[PDB]
Design a protein around this ligand. Structure first.
Ligand code: SAH
Ligand code: ZN
Ligand code: ZN
Ligand code: ZN
Ligand code: ZN
Ligand code: ZN
Ligand code: ZN
Ligand code: ZN
Ligand code: ZN
Lengths: 761, 479
């Protein structure tokens, strides 16, 4: 009945629709625009220029006029020259110092990704594929050729893309094509639409962009591992967010997150909690199993996801002293005895080598000794390469291939995310011995030194007890002057809490901007942090090509840099001097490397801030730096960072809180662009991250408080949908496996969702 | 009756050389005069602002142009940008002027004094535009990469910067800023080859300590053109944009964009999450066969031949109620082009009627001009066998069939039809619309800007050598 010639003949007749429709569309869009022309507004009552007569004369300037007439051209006379008085107006203001881009403030360093004849052809072809794509199905119905359906044409195409991708397509599509007229149609489509000379398309190019093609490119524990997969893969060990500023960006913009899958996934961490629980040797208000046993009535039939919830909660709560019955109950909305019976039916079942102490470090007395600075690189950040923390069964030795011990020229102390414990491992960091009725962790008066100060690290809110870092590294106590008068003193970055500073024109000849003190700063006080985009050496090179540079070397050997070109803080304006009044230092801050500025002299309000940029500037191979408030009185003009309004002394100092929603949104969209995640997954991950990124968590010490704020705030939202509570329990399981969530917090989360559901009922 | 009348060269003037390369970079007519008031315009050279008034005359030998003011920027900068504003107290005309040192000088043109200076930009300003919704709102596009929204209202006197369109919108110098008639949407473009659509928030009637910072455009693309974009404008909700080395003004549209829909918030904007993608949009429609729907559509291409490698060359549409839409543009080889957009649809209705009559009457079609006699009268002359189609009088001769031979009584030649399709056919998005009127100039002239009088009877083109060409339609000259 059909042949290539006849389909090709038919397609040429149908293709005439395309220029017909385009003309109807364009004309329609133009007619609509004319009819909808704007009516002129804000017209004056009187002609404002009415009294102004010609300024001509037979400080002045000349104008020669010519008059024309006719179809072609045409000068009438030769022209007529005239003199006109000139009104000289001089501007009453100097422009502000120059810059490029809008300089936006960031609370902490953010992660940046890496940044012609073919371009034109591809674009011409893409635009053409876009216009023809909506005509394929209408044309296929009009033609009504047996077996010529879009699905069969895609089927034909997959029966030349990568071998794997052809199989993924064939998987969901099958080989049910016969009568494979899909051949004769393809041949005819390419003769008509793929003529070489532009704009052109092969049927495959249209098919490849189709919504159903383009995206298609022991036992209990295996279930639980797969179930918690997204949380272990993306959930951050530092800040607890699923799209954050932690992790590595590969040469292609693929990201290796700093997650549980960095620390060998779920199981090593889980096994260790179970072991810890064994060594360790209030009923719910939803028909508790502790009072109602197992029931005797009949329940609705449980779903796969419902048994899954009971499975991952059972596993992650482990050998506890907190029971899954209550929590799962409050998650699903089924009574407590109901899940206790399901658990009885399912019959679910759960699955120190003496090391020689180091002569350079004592973790018991919490101190360094006998030429420790030649035995380690823990404090030497500039020479430190970043590797994943410990995740091995044996001791932390070179012989056992421990990265902490063997990866560097010298060993490094085992940090909090290393799976080894303080008892089994001599390399483990344990914290501060430091305790005083006054100031400690300096910078130290009373007793032995501060091991943290020594190791170029800020104190750990969890490890540094009687410091009291716990309450001083809490951002909620940032402005508690009374609290900070007492011990530690080594939590500046965690506080932040920067000294009042003001932007202005630098005193340095033709330098542009400078940063000025807006408060008296004493010697050794924390001034400000250097924030920016975290970029690689290579990415930095690309930015240096396409006079003024904002790069700062963070981890030299590792090849990490901080670029404050667009994103950073006022510290980007601090100019160079061989002998400045401040100094940068690279600090280890809860598995983050951050730059802090410390005053090395007493600085007075109005005095400009200066520092030494280092090796890589004569105004007294990547080029970059390295190691009741009022507006002050100054010889230099000062400005608001955002508005650039010139400031005047004595005025209340501009102090604008950072709005990071623009940044929160980019993390929302980054998860929205993941194919590997289900929409039910993205709905929750985005909800949790939007919340947890706002709290800028660096230590697990504050997570239980924010977790509880999240339950209390989102309780109605969580109980209003089956997938939301399901996802939340996945998170809670992952966090319990890590030992990040105290039992009591989960017990309290049970009661929050239980009264939520009760109220909504 | 002469709604189809297109402009003709009436006057031309060379202003004294004031930069020693002297050129008029801008021309803008004052838009707040009462209806009937003589039009007043301002031509901005590198150092001066030449305020003219145009008066219709009966004498072909009389001069319609009178320079009612000539201001000189006595700063150390060179200017290229202008827009008109109003004093929010006295309703007196203000002329904003911007240049290479990054400031906006607002002049009290009637009193010959400086109103104020707007400081804040960190580079030279290439373009200025006033909000059609608020005469006190001004947008400035700069080398610093940002757009600054300023308010001349008394409320904002202390801090005039109401908004900064910054963040991740642009990476190089901006050459164009354009406002939507609703005053809520802004188009920006430049050297980075990106056209961005930004949605402005509502500005409080009170003091703003800091501007509202916008970080992401609601639509962003580098795919409409293949070079630096130096002119961008809205035509309703449609976009008109021009790029260097293309010899065209592209008419195109953002899929899913409508100003009838509620304005989206800042957090509704797409963010660059995938570095590969060169087009991103909040407006993108749900229904399409594509997994990644076409986010824009190329509609037509106005052919502006011989522009060369020149940039900072801008067009202008005359878009007013009860008058035809006229697009005017001047190239780099002494030529001024005009398109009467109202011709497209008339030609379109004509061609459809002609194809229909050709099919229904087996080619027996007689065409009669709309300038007498009547459709019913013509049918009465040729009888039932022949079909009659009415032609617009301006459509002069030389899947629609041409006459079999020259002496055939039905249809037109291929030459006639190809001439009409060159100028009026809109069926090909990558076609080339031939100007409806091309007026030559003497001798060498590169056009920088085009401006239309409120009543559309005057069209002023300004450019190199400090030259101004004045074109007029609906003249009163008694020859
Ligand atoms: N001691 C010095 N000598 C010369 N230039 C200096 C300097 N200290 C800082 N700079 C200038 O400041 C740049 C670093 S960025 C510092 C902020 C800058 N003044 C601004 O206006 O944005 C350098 O690339 C250089 O141009
Ligand atoms: Zn993180
Ligand atoms: Zn219970
Ligand atoms: Zn180890
Ligand atoms: Zn370790
Ligand atoms: Zn260890
Ligand atoms: Zn200490
Ligand atoms: Zn400590
Ligand atoms: Zn401490």
């Amino acid at each position: 009945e059909w042949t290539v010639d006849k389909i090709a003949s038919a397609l040429s007749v149908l293709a005439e629709e395309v220029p017909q429709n385009h003309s109807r569309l364009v004309n329609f869009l133009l007619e609509e625009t004319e009819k909808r022309a704007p009516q002129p507004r804000h017209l004056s009552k009187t002609d404002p220029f009415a009294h102004m007569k010609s300024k001509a004369i037979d400080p002045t300037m000349d104008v020669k006029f010519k008059q024309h007439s006719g179809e072609y051209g045409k000068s009438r006379n030769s022209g007529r020259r005239f003199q006109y008085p000139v009104v000289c107006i001089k501007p009453d203001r100097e422009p502000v110092p120059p810059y490029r881009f809008h300089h936006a403030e960031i609370r902490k360093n953010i992660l940046a990704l890496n940044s012609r004849s073919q371009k034109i052809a591809k674009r011409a072809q893409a635009e053409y594929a876009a216009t023809l794509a909506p005509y394929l199905e209408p044309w296929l119905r009009k033609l009504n050729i047996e077996g010529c359906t879009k699905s069969n044409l895609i089927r034909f195409m997959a029966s030349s893309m990568t071998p794997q991708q052809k199989s993924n397509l064939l998987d969901t599509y099958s080989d049910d094509m016969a009568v494979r007229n899909a051949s004769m149609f393809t041949e005819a489509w390419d003769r008509v639409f793929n003529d070489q000379s532009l704009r052109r398309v092969a049927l495959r190019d249209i098919l490849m962009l189709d919504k159903n093609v383009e995206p298609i490119f022991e036992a209990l524990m295996q279930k639980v591992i797969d179930a918690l997969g997204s949380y272990t893969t993306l959930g951050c060990l530092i800040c607890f967010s699923h799209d954050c500023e932690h992790g590595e960006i590969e040469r292609d913009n693929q990201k290796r997150c700093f997650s549980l899958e960095e620390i060998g996934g779920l199981m090593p961490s889980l096994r260790r909690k179970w072991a810890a629980q064994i060594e360790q040797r209030p009923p719910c208000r939803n028909e508790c199993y502790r009072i109602h046993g197992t029931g005797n009535q009949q329940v609705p039939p449980w779903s796969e996801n419902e048994v899954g919830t009971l499975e991952w909660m059972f596993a992650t709560i482990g050998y506890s002293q907190l029971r899954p019955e209550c929590f799962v109950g409050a998650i699903l909305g089924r009574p407590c005895w109901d899940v206790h019976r399901k658990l009885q039916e399912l019959d679910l079942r759960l699955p120190i080598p003496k090391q020689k102490s180091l002569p350079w470090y004592d973790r018991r007395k919490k101190q360094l000794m006998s030429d420790w600075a030649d035995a380690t690189i823990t404090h030497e950040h500039a020479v430190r390469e970043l590797f994943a923390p410990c995740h091995h069964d044996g001791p932390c030795t070179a012989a056992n291939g421990c990265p902490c011990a063997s990866a560097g020229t010298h060993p490094v102390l085992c940090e909090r995310f290393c799976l080894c414990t303080a008892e089994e491992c001599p390399l483990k960091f344990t914290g501060c011995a430091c305790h005083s009725s006054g100031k400690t962790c300096l910078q130290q008066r009373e007793g032995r030194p501060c091991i943290c100060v020594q190791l170029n690290r800020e104190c750990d809110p969890t490890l540094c007890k009687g410091c009291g870092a716990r309450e001083r590294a809490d951002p909620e106590n940032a402005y508690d002057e009374v609290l900070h008068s007492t011990g530690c003193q080594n939590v500046a970055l965690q506080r932040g809490a920067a000294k009042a500073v003001v932007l202005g024109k630098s005193q340095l000849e033709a330098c542009g901007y400078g940063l000025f003190a807006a408060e008296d700063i004493e010697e050794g006080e924390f001034v400000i942090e250097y924030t920016g985009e975290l970029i690689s050496h290579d990415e930095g090179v690309r930015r240096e090509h396409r006079k003024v540079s904002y790069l700062f070397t963070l981890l030299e050997q590792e090849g990490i840099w901080v670029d404050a070109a667009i994103y950073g803080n006022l510290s980007r304006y601090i100019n160079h001097a061989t002998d400045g009044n401040i100094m940068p230092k690279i600090m280890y801050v809860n598995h983050e490397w951050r730059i802090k500025f410390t005053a090395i002299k007493d600085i007075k309000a109005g005095e400009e801030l200066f520092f030494n940029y280092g090796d890589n500037l004569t105004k007294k191979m990547l080029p970059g730096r390295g190691v009741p408030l009022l507006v002050p009185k100054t010889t230099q003009p000062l400005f608001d960072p955002l508005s650039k309004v010139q400031l005047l002394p004595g005025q209340p100092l501009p102090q604008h809180p950072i709005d990071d929603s623009w940044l929160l949104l980019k993390h929302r969209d980054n998860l929205q662009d993941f194919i590997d995640l289900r929409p039910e997954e993205k709905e929750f991950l985005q909800e949790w991250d939007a919340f947890i990124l706002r709290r800028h968590i660096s230590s697990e010490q504050y997570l239980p408080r924010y977790f509880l704020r999240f339950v209390r705030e989102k309780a109605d939202w969580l109980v209003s949908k089956r997938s939301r509570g399901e996802e939340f329990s996945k998170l809670v399981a992952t966090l319990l496996a890590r030992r990040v969530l105290p039992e009591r917090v989960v017990i309290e989360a049970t009661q929050v969702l239980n009264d939520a559901r009760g109220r909504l009922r | 009756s002469a709604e189809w009348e297109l402009p003709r060269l009436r006057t031309s003037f060379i202003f004294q050389d004031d930069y020693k390369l002297a050129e008029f970079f801008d021309v803008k007519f004052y838009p707040y005069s009462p209806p009937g008031a003589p039009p007043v315009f301002a031509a901005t050279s590198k150092k001066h602002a030449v305020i003219c008034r145009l008066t219709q005359t009966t004498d072909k030998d009389a001069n319609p142009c009178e320079i009612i003011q000539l201001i000189r920027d006595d700063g150390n900068e060179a200017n290229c940008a202008s827009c008109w504003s109003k004093d929010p107290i006295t309703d007196q005309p203000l002329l904003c002027i911007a240049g290479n040192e990054g400031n906006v000088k607002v002049y009290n043109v009637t009193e010959g004094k400086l109103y104020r200076t707007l400081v804040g930009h960190g580079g030279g300003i290439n373009d200025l535009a006033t909000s059609p919704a608020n005469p006190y709102i001004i947008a400035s596009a700069s080398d610093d990469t940002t757009i600054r929204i300023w308010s001349l209202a008394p409320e904002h006197e202390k801090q005039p910067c109401v908004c900064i369109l910054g963040g991740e919108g642009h990476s190089y110098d901006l050459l164009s800023v354009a406002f939507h008639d609703n005053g809520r949407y802004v188009l920006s473009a430049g050297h980075d080859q990106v056209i961005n659509l930004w949605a402005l928030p509502e500005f409080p009637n009170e003091h703003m300590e800091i501007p509202i910072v916008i970080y992401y455009p609601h639509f962003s693309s580098s795919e409409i053109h293949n070079n630096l974009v130096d002119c961008v404008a809205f035509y309703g909700d449609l976009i008109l944009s021009r790029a260097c080395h293309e010899d065209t003004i592209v008419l195109w549209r953002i899929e899913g964009f409508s100003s009838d829909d509620p304005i989206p918030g800042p957090l509704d904007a797409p963010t660059p999450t995938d570095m590969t993608k060169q087009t991103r949009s909040y407006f993108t429609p749900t229904v399409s066969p594509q997994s990644r729907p076409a986010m824009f559509t190329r509609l037509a291409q106005f052919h502006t031949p011989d522009c060369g490698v020149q940039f900072f060359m801008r067009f202008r549409m005359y878009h007013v109620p009860g008058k035809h839409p006229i697009l005017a543009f001047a190239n780099a080889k002494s030529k001024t082009f005009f398109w009467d957009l109202a011709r497209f649809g008339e030609y379109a209705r004509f061609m459809a009627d002609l194809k229909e009559a050709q099919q229904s009457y087996n080619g027996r079609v007689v065409v009669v001009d709309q300038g007498q006699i009547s459709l019913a009268q013509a049918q009465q002359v040729h009888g039932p066998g022949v079909g009659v189609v009415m032609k617009p009088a301006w459509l002069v001769p030389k899947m629609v069939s041409a006459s079999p031979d020259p002496d055939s009584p039905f249809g037109f030649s291929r030459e006639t039809l190809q001439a009409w399709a060159d100028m009026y056919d809109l069926s090909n998005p990558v076609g080339l619309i031939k100007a409806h009127r091309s007026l030559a100039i003497d001798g060498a002239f590169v056009g920088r800007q085009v401006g239309w009088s409120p009543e559309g009877e005057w069209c002023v083109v300004v450019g190199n050598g400090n030259r101004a060409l004045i074109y007029q339609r609906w003249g009163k000259e008694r020859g």
